[PDB]
Amino acid sequence: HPKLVSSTPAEGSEGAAPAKIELHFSENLVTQFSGAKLVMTAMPGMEHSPMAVKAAVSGGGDPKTMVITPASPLTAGTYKVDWRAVSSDTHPITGSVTFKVK
Template identity: 55%
Template sequence: MSHFRSFTLRLVAVSALLASGALFAHPKVVSTTPADHAEVSAPATIEVSFSETLMTQLSGADLTMTEKPGATTPTKIEAKTAASADAKSLVITPAHPLGAGTYRVDWHVVSTDTHAVKGSFSFRVK
């Protein structure tokens, strides 16, 4: 086998490996506002930003108050979820100002390449 042909086969193999990584990529959380485990004043909106463009009609989030003074039962919080202008973030807007306590955001997204992922993060309101 010639050196050129051997080099070409190796180049094709490396290219295939690199391409397969891109094909199996999933959207990853780039940032959250508030940050995971942060203690903050009541935010008007909560944002989860991703590494890929989302299929917004198949993506969403739920907001739950998991701890509050004098209560032990988690409470789902009424909130609206929308996509950012670039469709790389979910923006959660609570229907009412958030009171003191701990909150969890459970999100699920599908990227434009149809990969679905889900996760959660939490924060505390002073």
């Protein structure tokens, strides 16, 4: 209803890498305390513990429209987008989306 209404992040997407990660909220939040990052949680060679990966966080022409780009070409493996959105009146929403790549 209010808060996050639509996104195209990569909700359990498998196969080709997700193009970008879009987050859209009914509410005009983002009081200078929102952001998002990407971590890889399976990658070849290692299968070592989940670790921070290279993403760039942007927004559209609205502060309430978050747009996260991967900065490296996402290769075969599994990743987690962690996003954290905050409002003026506090009300943190902190959340995550996992996806896979081949």
